[PDB]
Design an enzyme around this catalytic site. Structure first.
Site, PDB file in Angstrom:
ATOM      1  N   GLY A 144       0.773  -1.226   0.000  1.00  0.00           N
ATOM      2  CA  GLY A 144       0.000   0.000   0.000  1.00  0.00           C
ATOM      3  C   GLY A 144       0.808   1.282   0.000  1.00  0.00           C
ATOM      4  O   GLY A 144       2.022   1.285   0.225  1.00  0.00           O
ATOM      5  N   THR A 145       0.102   2.373  -0.270  1.00  0.00           N
ATOM      6  CA  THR A 145       0.609   3.730  -0.150  1.00  0.00           C
ATOM      7  C   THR A 145       1.277   3.951   1.207  1.00  0.00           C
ATOM      8  O   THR A 145       0.921   3.304   2.187  1.00  0.00           O
ATOM      9  CB  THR A 145      -0.564   4.701  -0.334  1.00  0.00           C
ATOM     10  N   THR A 146       2.246   4.853   1.275  1.00  0.00           N
ATOM     11  CA  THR A 146       2.906   5.090   2.555  1.00  0.00           C
ATOM     12  C   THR A 146       2.195   6.167   3.381  1.00  0.00           C
ATOM     13  O   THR A 146       1.748   7.186   2.848  1.00  0.00           O
ATOM     14  CB  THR A 146       4.455   5.309   2.410  1.00  0.00           C
TER      15      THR A 146
END
Lengths: 235, 233, 237, 236, 111, 198, 243, 241, 250
Positions: free
Chosen positions: C23-25
């Site tokens: 996932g996105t950070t």
């Protein structure tokens, strides 16, 4: 509760298989009564036979069963058969007709055959009973929910041998004492033990109450089996 | 790594993927193309309908949800019926209980949450439909894209289904033109119709071929079919 | 899921972790009287409306929540956190303390690791706020595991982000200010975007500080957002 | 071999796809929509000469303005017909009017979804042609699949002979077909695809008209249309 | 004991012409000997060219008008935007009212 | 209110039941048969509350007929009466009890005896040589206490009833519009439809 | 992928692999705990490892105050530890409401043991990968230590240890009681019992501890409490000026 | 609540559990129904692996549903009881609410409906039973015969057979039963029924049974001797060169 | 949440075996040996208190349990399974009997009830059978003294003497030789102590052995005086001190 490609019921067939290894039980129907006889599964010296019961069960006062299969599964069914008999008596003020009690138990068995995902009961019954519609009656029920009436029949171990012998010596005009004799002889030849002793047996009769005009259930005491084993030339 | 991990939605693959969800997403790809785009005064849906036969109907793809909101579908149509029905109730609840038209954004979140439960239940299945949601509410025109994974995003324009990428490319370049089509309904529809064309190996889009929907400042959500779309071909 | 592997681990949880790492950070930073939260939003297309796909979520009025992984799983979790906060308030009057809120999420997430009919959550959630006795920051993994943090990072660039955070911790033992943590969070997201940059991105920050928001959760908009974007754009060139 | 409501990697529901294969195994049904009415015809397909052909009920009334033909596992259609009848009667009770054909079809299709509270273990093994008339949209024909999807058609064929029959329906159908023409066409295309020779006992016709509603054609009346098709297709 | 009913007064009047109809009402809303409002409308346009008034206990009247307006909305959704004819509305209103046969809406309604 | 009489002679049971059905100010019917055949040799008469009366009788009738077909066998009158009793006993403690009193007249073919059971709505059962429900018993019991003999023929039984009816036409306030009379014996159930102007 | 590896049914040798794997999970945190009884107190010690520099150390604990009188230390992953903690708190509060006296240490142990037994028998619930050590000064029994595991087993202890290096600590403790000839630490202050506990922890593990490497819980008549770092430091200073 | 779907579709579009239920029917003993001008006759057979049976008390294969309708079956015996009970309850219920006994068709549609439902319910297997249902509609003289199978399908038959070696007897019946001239008497109707059973049974001994149904609840079961009269007449009559 | 497996985890195999019941019995085999011997005025049940580290307190572990004032139980196999059967047994002695008849159940009937609980775990969905065998010793006015064995299947049978677990084969043989129908209670204890000596490896004293009797009524264990119509429980745990005294004259 699933069908095989052939149209057989897997768990049923395997339950019958299970029953085929259980101590033998025989029912014999006479003109004047019914005999029930059963052999205990490989027993021991220290096993109590006095306070013991494992194959022969009283359902009401006019009906008894012989059990081949899983004892515990059978107690479940015996209990509900007893209750069903009492509901019928409460409802109608008449003792339950033998066929009706039998149809009900078989219906319960049939249920575990068609729905629920639960294993069937690993039990077969021989029913010995009397009512005033049909007189003396002998029935059989197995895990498939099937039931049939008999003049003489066997369940459990060595049914093939047992059935051959009964077919050979049974005749319609038999008395109860001859049936008692036939029962023990048939067990004598189908045992897996050396010889037939009293402590390996359960025995019951349903006679016309000696002198009364009423119906009597006798579950033989240890000594009574021991005694009946002498007269018949087995000691 | 691809083997015993696509049995149900309740199982992760060793990669961290949910395959039943991915396969649901796939039913969109095999669905007839639909386009969404908005300016500041209006929002438009253009759906190309697909027929089973030359003798058949071109299966309806635009569903009205309230007077200010509606959507277009690509994928399992029965699934768009369950979800638009849910959206109709939620829009309805907002009106009866609060005398408040439901914000397009809230509709987005609600659809997301409904789809999510079906990516986590046993014996259930993810939805197999993509949805383009347009509306006009207290903050103007909106377009949303719903994915059965439960991901919803707000966009100026987009497209979903068979060869959507053609229309999505065109809209990416036309961006600064269509967003300025304010108070000019027909030019926003035209920009939408010319967007859906970048995705047609099929043909000349006909009269039964086309379905159009518009909502905006003083325009309640209305669907145009056949006769009324002839002037846009 | 209700299955231990022979090493004593739960393989379904372990796989959920992979979805998180995918996932996105996103990050959290504790400051001397509050907490700051930031996330990376991938601009899939220019057609995305800028500033209009909010990721950070509020619980009650004092708690902020951000996550990486399956976005719907994060939303499901926040909804439950909201019911859980409401139920605490209804009965105890006082707003839910952060340690208390952390265990509520904790227990719920853990329950989804007990049964074979349910799957674990595909998110790690960074959340926190200001309560009766100070600021609190927490991170919660798919296993239901959570702890208090000075700084927290999850998603594709968690390693570089954690590295940055560790540097801040070690170089600010006195504590960081909310205003500073806001800029710093912008720096760290840009720095963390290095590990996920085949796509352009949009920065989103929120915060909850006693002196800057009276202990309420608030999004960083306008000038203060720009000041942070400017500060971050500077220290990468 | 994993689930009932499972997707293939192509994004189709296994069980829905297999139910359609069951329908292809069924007897042919054909529907033709005109401006004078809608005709429905079926292939009885008696498994034996001893089967009383009259007892084969594959065309049923739903309401005076709506009839329906089935193809596939026809036993599954009983609860569908029952639900359709209830929905139409109920609508009249609540609204003092006839249900629209589309609405009734949509209702039946809602029922179809309820497999997997979802009290039904599998999809239906049967497709339905639903034909009727209403004031708004005139004469209509619908194909309702066990997926819950339905389709309006000028003409449509379902069952074992549907591939051939549909192409034949493509060539033959035009927007000016009279009712009498349509009846002849159904009989013709049925004659082509039926594994047996079409007579009045192994095939059945029916229609719905505004004036007279849904009528099943009795054998004597069908035999005449046969003894007229054969004669129309002798001169040419 | 709680009385779930009240009486808000009011009077309504419907007349059918050859190619028109009127439904009129006073705008006064009362409780006992008090005026709650001098202008509180109770005749409503419900879409599909239907006007409705449910007079008596105003809470029950408002509920019923709401449920009928909604009924009309859902009729459009479920039946491809068909116009709800006046006879069809009436029958539907019978079912709404009768659904509460054992805890009735205390209103006399005219459409 | 309605007359429900039962008399058990030596070889049969006779039931007599009033023909009137009265609601309020009006006699609505003067030819009502307040009876259901339960089996070829068992008949039930009933009186009580307006709706409950027939619903119960017909419900019992369905049950007995079901038992018959299931066992290809006719239950004894004693068994039928016990079934009916238990039903009423369950009913009395339910949400809305059946307000129905019954007489059951049957011929037991196995015993070759006629039998009469009286059961009220509470499930109170008794076997009797003669029975009645409601007000009518306030006249007939003492009359039959006097004129009844255990060894009577069916013909004597009918004359005993004639007296019972006559006394009720003399002293009861309401016009019950005569009785229908039915005999239950070894040959089943027949109606003596000619009793009113005899 | 045999079913007897994945759910709690018997294997042909009459085993429950899932339970066995749950015991394995109890060591995942690589922490050792021990418990000892004083004259009129009960002490639990557990290692405290804070690897990550980003963590807030004050929130990293495996000791739990179950009630006023009962403490609990867990060996196993934190999610399962907290699940067991919440349940025991609920159980102890319910018991007091229903029965009018404080739940004894051993009864709560038994109750938790029974709950774990259920997961041992029912297919839909996995066992918890935890060992729970319960401690109190019981109003009837005095200093008490009762320990439960994923099998549903529980017993009382003179002393005990749990974790990767359990065996070393156990034998170390056995050897102490073997010599001292009594079943408790003959010490009047709880401070000296803690000091004993840490000293024997150091010996069995061959490791020196600073104040942040340990975790200490003490049960006295009518209270269980945990020590602060500075309380522990004071305990560490005292063992230095002796050992 | 066990609602795990047992009856499902295969890729070829078959429901194997229903399919295997038919195999249990083929395993079951033979049953035949044939309808004359003013009667319908049903006929069955009995197995041979045991014959120390009691005849009086063992359930016969023909069951009365109401006094005017009977049901015979091939397949699982235990399964058939459940259908018979449910059919009997329905027949009483129809009497109670409609004040008329069931039409033979209605009773058939009901039983077939029950079998169908068991083909699409979670956690239940289809009935391993196929039935023949015969009798007369109340106040009607036109004879009625119907068959149901596990799927839930049902239809009327001039004559039909089910069970083991029904293939052979359906062969016979197709050659011998004439639509234009049904067996105009009860006697000559039982004639065609015995001939059709003779191909499979072996001897007309303790195995073949008959039941005759006439209008207005007239249902008589035959005795061994009355059957033996039909047995003896055909074997030696239809053997000549 | 909720339960999925609604089907039996014990099913019949083609050979007619019930696997899970066999495997339960295998688990019982591994269990520490336990035994029971019936006298003329008593029954004795006994087992080993297999300690896991000398730091564990053996007395806190209940291997021999009172079910009613006149009925006791001991087991072999899985301890935690036993412990929950004891709780359900005690409770059912009340709900199914004492609350109905105002007296405790007779031995055979309580045994019957336990057997029911075990049978149900053989057939209900989502469960495995209990991995224990029980020996239940008791007294009731109309049957006197009795001893029963209950197995994982729910089957039960009465014994004069028997043993279960590890050293059962050898112990059954040892008992066969030593059992006559005239044994006083003290003799049965002594025979029980001898039999248990074969099975044990390490220390063999009063702190590693658990032994209870069903004998005479113990009025001093009643708790109250003044109703002469009960003189207390027949069940008694022998104390560690009492076991050792009988070992010195062994």
């Amino acid at each position: 509760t699933i069908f095989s490609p052939e149209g057989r019921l897997y768990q049923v067939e395997y339950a019958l298989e299970s029953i085929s290894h259980a101590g033998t039980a025989i029912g014999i129907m006479a003109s004047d009564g019914i005999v029930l006889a059963a052999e205990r599964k490989v027993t021991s010296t220290l096993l109590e036979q006095d306070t013991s019961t494992e194959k022969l069960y009283k359902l009401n006062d006019k009906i008894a069963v012989a059990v081949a299969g899983l004892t515990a599964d059978a107690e479940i069914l015996i209990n509900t058969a007893r209750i069903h008999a009492q509901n019928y008596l409460k409802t109608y003020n008449e003792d339950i007709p033998v066929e009706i009690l039998v149809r009900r138990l078989s219906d319960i068995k049939q249920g575990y055959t068609q729905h629920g995902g639960l294993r069937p009961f690993g039990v077969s019954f021989i029913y010995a009973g009397y009512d005033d519609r049909y007189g003396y009656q002998l029935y059989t029920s197995n895990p498939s929910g099937n039931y049939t009436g008999w003049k003489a029949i066997s369940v459990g171990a060595n049914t093939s041998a047992a059935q051959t012998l009964l077919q050979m010596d049974y005749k319609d005009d038999m008395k109860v004492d001859d049936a008692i004799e036939l029962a023990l002889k048939t067990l004598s030849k189908t045992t897996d033990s050396s010889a037939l002793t009293y402590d390996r047996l359960e025995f019951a009769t349903i006679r016309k109450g000696a002198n009364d005009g009423e119906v009597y259930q006798k579950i033989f005491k240890p000594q009574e089996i021991k005694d009946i084993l002498v007269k018949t030339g087995i000691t | 790594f691809r083997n015993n991990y696509d049995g149900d939605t309740v199982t992760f693959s060793p990669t961290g993927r949910l395959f039943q969800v991915e396969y649901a997403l796939e039913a969109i790809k095999q669905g007839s193309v639909t386009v969404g785009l908005r300016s500041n005064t209006h929002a438009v849906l253009v759906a190309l309908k697909r027929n089973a036969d030359e003798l058949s109907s071109y299966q309806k793809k635009i569903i009205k949800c309230d007077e200010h909101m509606g959507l277009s579908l690509a994928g399992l149509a029965p699934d768009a019926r369950v979800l638009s029905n849910y959206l109709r109730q939620q829009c309805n609840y907002s009106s009866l209980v609060f005398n408040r038209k439901l914000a397009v954004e809230r509709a987005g979140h609600l659809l997301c949450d409904k789809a999510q439960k079906n990516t986590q239940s046993y014996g259930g299945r993810p939805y197999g439909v993509g949805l383009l949601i347009i509306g006009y509410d207290k903050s103007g025109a909106h377009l949303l894209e719903f994915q059965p994974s439960g991901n919803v995003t707000e966009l100026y324009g987009t497209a979903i289904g068979a060869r959507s990428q053609g229309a999505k490319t065109y809209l990416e370049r036309t961006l600064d033109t269509f967003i300025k089509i304010d108070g000019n309904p027909d030019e926003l529809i035209k920009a939408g119709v010319e967007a859906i064309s970048q995705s047609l190996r099929d043909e000349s889009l006909t009269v039964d071929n086309l379905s159009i929907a518009i909502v905006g400042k003083d325009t309640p959500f209305t669907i145009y079919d056949g006769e009324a779309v002839a002037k846009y071909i | 899921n209700s299955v231990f592997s022979p090493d004593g681990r739960n393989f379904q949880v372990e796989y959920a972790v992979k979805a998180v790492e995918n996932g996105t950070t996103s990050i959290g930073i504790k400051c001397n009287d509050g907490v700051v939260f930031a996330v990376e939003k991938l601009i899939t297309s220019k057609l995305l409306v800028p500033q209009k796909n909010v990721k950070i979520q509020v619980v009650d009025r004092h708690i902020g929540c951000v996550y990486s992984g399956l976005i719907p799983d994060g939303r499901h979790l926040v909804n439950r956190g909201r019911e859980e906060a409401a139920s605490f308030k209804k009965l105890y009057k006082t707003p839910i303390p952060i340690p208390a809120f952390a265990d509520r999420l904790g227990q719920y997430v853990q329950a989804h690791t007990l049964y074979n009919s349910v799957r674990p959550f595909g998110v790690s959630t960074i959340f926190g706020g200001v309560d009766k006795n100070g600021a609190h920051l927490y991170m919660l993994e798919p296993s239901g595991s959570y702890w208090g943090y000075k700084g927290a990072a999850t998603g594709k660039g968690r390693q570089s982000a954690k590295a940055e955070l560790e540097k801040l911790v070690d170089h600010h033992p006195e504590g960081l200010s909310a205003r500073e943590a806001v800029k710093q969070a912008a720096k760290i997201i840009y720095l963390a975007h290095e590990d996920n940059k085949e796509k352009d991105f949009e920065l989103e920050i929120s915060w909850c500080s006693l002196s800057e928001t009276n202990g309420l959760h608030k999004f960083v908009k306008g000038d203060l957002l720009q000041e942070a974007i400017d500060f971050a754009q500077k220290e990468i060139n | 071999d994993r689930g009932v409501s499972t997707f293939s990697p192509e994004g189709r529901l296994f069980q829905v796809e297999y139910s359609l294969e069951a329908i292809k195994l069924g007897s042919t049904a054909i529907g033709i929509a005109t401006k004078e009415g809608v005709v429905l015809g079926v292939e009885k397909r008696a498994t034996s000469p001893l089967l009383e052909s009259d007892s084969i009920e594959k065309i049923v009334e739903i309401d005076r303005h709506i009839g329906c033909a089935m193809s596939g596992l026809t036993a599954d259609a009983r609860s569908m017909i029952e639900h359709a009848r209830t929905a139409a009667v109920t609508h009249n009770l609540y609204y003092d009017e006839d249900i629209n054909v589309e609405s009734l079809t949509q209702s039946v299709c809602d029922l179809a979804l309820r497999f997997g509270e979802r009290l039904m273990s599998r999809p239906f093994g049967v497709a339905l042609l639903i034909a009727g008339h209403d004031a708004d949209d005139g004469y209509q024909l619908f194909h309702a699949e066990p997926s819950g999807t339905f389709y309006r058609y000028n003409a449509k064929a379902i069952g074992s002979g549907s591939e051939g029959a549909q192409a034949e329906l493509l060539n033959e159908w035009h927007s000016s077909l009279t009712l009498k023409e349509a009846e002849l066409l159904v009989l013709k295309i049925l004659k082509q695809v039926m594994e047996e020779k079409l007579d009045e006992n192994n095939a059945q016709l029916s229609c719905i008209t505004k004036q007279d509603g849904f009528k099943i054609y009795d054998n004597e009346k069908t035999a005449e249309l046969i003894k007229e098709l054969k004669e129309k297709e002798a001169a040419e | 004991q709680f009385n779930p009913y009240g009486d808000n007064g009011g009077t309504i009047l419907g007349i059918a012409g050859e190619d028109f109809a009127v439904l009129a009402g006073d705008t006064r809303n009362i409780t006992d000997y008090s005026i709650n409002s001098r202008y509180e409308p109770k005749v409503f346009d419900c879409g599909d060219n239907i006007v409705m008034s449910a007079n008596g206990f105003a809470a029950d009247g408002d509920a019923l008008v709401k449920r009928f307006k909604n009924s009309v909305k859902w009729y459009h959704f479920d039946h491809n935007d068909k116009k709800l004819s006046i006879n069809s509305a009436a029958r539907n209103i019978q079912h709404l009212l009768y659904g509460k046969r054992f805890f009735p809406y205390y209103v006399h309604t005219i459409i | 209110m309605d007359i429900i009489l039962g008399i058990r002679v030596q070889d049969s049971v006779i039931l007599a039941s009033s023909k009137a059905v009265t609601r309020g100010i009006s006699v609505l019917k003067d030819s009502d048969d307040k009876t259901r055949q339960l089996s070829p040799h068992t008949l039930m008469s009933f009186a009580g509350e307006a709706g409950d009366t027939v619903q119960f009788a017909e419900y019992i009738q369905a049950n007995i007929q079901l038992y018959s077909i299931r066992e290809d066998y006719e239950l004894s009158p004693q068994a039928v009466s016990s079934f009916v009793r238990q039903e009423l006993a369950k009913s009395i403690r339910s949400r809305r009890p059946y307000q129905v009193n019954v007489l059951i007249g049957g011929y037991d073919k196995k015993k070759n005896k006629p039998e009469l059971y009286q059961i009220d709505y509470l499930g109170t059962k008794v076997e009797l040589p003669y029975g009645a429900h409601g007000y009518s018993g306030f006249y007939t019991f003492s009359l039959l206490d006097h004129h009844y003999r255990p060894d009577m023929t069916t013909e004597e039984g009918l004359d005993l009833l004639k007296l019972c009816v006559q006394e009720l036409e003399k002293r009861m306030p309401m016009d019950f519009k005569g009785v229908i009379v039915k005999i239950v014996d070894k040959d089943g159930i027949r109606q003596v439809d000619d009793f009113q102007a005899q | 992928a045999g079913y007897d590896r994945h759910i709690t049914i018997f294997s042909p040798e009459g085993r429950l692999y899932q339970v066995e794997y749950a015991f394995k999970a109890t060591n995942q945190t690589n922490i050792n705990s021990l418990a000892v009884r004083g004259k009129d107190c009960t002490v639990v010690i557990s290692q405290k490892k804070v690897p990550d520099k980003l963590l807030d150390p004050t929130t990293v604990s495996y000791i739990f105050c179950i009630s006023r009188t009962i403490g609990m230390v867990v060996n196993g992953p934190i999610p399962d530890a907290r699940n067991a903690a919440l349940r025991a708190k609920a159980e102890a509060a319910e018991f007091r409401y229903k029965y009018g006296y404080d739940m004894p240490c051993d009864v709560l142990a038994k109750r938790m043991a029974n709950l774990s037994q259920i997961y041992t028998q029912r297919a839909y619930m996995r066992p918890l990968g935890v060992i729970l050590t319960f401690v109190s000064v019981d109003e009837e029994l005095g200093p008490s230590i009762y320990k439960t595991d994923p099998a549903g087993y529980y017993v009382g202890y003179k002393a005990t240890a749990t974790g990767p290096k359990q065996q070393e600590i156990t034998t170390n403790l056995e050897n102490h009681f073997k010599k001292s000839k009594i079943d408790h630490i003959n010490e009047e202050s709880w401070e000296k019992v803690v000091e004993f506990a840490i000293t024997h922890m150091i010996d069995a593990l061959g490791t020196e501890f600073s104040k942040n490497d340990l975790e200490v819980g003490v049960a006295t008549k009518d209270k269980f409490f945990t020590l602060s770092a500075e309380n522990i430091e004071e305990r560490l200073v005292a063992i230095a000026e002796q050992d | 609540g066990y609602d795990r779907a047992l009856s499902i579709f295969s890729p070829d579009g078959h429901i194997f559990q229903v399919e295997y239920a038919l195999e249990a029917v083929k395993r079951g003993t033979c049953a035949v129904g044939v309808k004359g001008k003013n009667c319908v006759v049903l006929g069955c057979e009995r197995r041979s692996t045991l014959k120390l049976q009691d005849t009086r008390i063992t359930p016969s294969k023909v069951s009365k549903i109401d006094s005017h309708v009977v049901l015979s079956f091939s397949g699982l015996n235990a399964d058939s009881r459940i259908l018979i009970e449910k059919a009997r309850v329905e027949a009483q219920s129809h009497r109670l609410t409609l004040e008329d006994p069931v039409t033979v068709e209605y009773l058939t549609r009901y039983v077939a409906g029950v079998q169908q439902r068991y083909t699409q319910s979670g956690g239940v297997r289809p009935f391993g039973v196929s039935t023949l249902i015969a009798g007369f509609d109340p106040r009607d003289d036109e004879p009625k015969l119907y068959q149901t199978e596990p799927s839930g399908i049902y239809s009327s038959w001039s004559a039909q057979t089910i069970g083991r070696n029904s293939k052979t007897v359906r062969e016979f019946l197709e050659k011998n039963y004439d639509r234009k001239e049904p067996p105009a008497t009860v006697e000559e109707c039982v004639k065609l029924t015995v001939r059709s059973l003779l191909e499979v049974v072996q001897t007309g001994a303790k195995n073949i049974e008959i039941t005759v149904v006439k209008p207005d609840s007239d249902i008589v079961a035959l005795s061994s001797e009355e059957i033996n009269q039909y047995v003896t007449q055909i074997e030696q009559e239809k053997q000549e060169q | 949440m909720t339960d999925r497996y609604s089907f039996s985890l014990t099913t019949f195999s083609p050979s007619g075996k019930l696997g899970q019941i066999d495997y339960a019995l295998t688990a019982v085999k591994q269990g520490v040996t336990s035994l029971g011997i019936k006298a003329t005025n008593g029954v004795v049940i006994a087992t080993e208190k297999k300690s896991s580290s000398p730091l564990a307190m053996s007395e806190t572990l209940s291997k021999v349990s009172l079910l009613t004032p006149d009925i006791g139980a001991v087991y072999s196999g899985m301890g935690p399974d036993y412990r929950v059967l004891v709780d359900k047994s005690r409770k059912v002695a009340h709900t199914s009997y004492k609350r109905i008849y105002g007296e405790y159940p007779p031995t055979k009937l309580l045994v019957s009830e336990v057997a029911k609980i075990m049978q149900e775990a053989t057939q209900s969905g989502g469960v495995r059978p209990f991995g224990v065998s029980l020996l239940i010793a008791g007294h009731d006015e109309f049957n006197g003294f009795s001893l029963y064995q209950v197995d994982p299947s729910g089957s039960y049978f009465p014994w004069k003497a028997t043993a279960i677990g590890k050293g059962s084969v050898a112990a059954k043989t040892f008992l066969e030789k030593r059992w006559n129908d005239e044994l006083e209670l003290e003799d049965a204890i002594h025979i029980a102590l001898l039999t248990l000596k074969e099975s044990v490896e390490g220390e063999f004293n009063g702190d590693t052995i658990e032994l209870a009797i069903i004998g005479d009524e113990n009025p001093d264990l009643l708790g109250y005086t003044g109703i002469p119509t009960d003189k207390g429980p027949r069940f008694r745990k022998l104390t560690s001190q009492e076991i050792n005294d009988r070992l010195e004259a062994l």
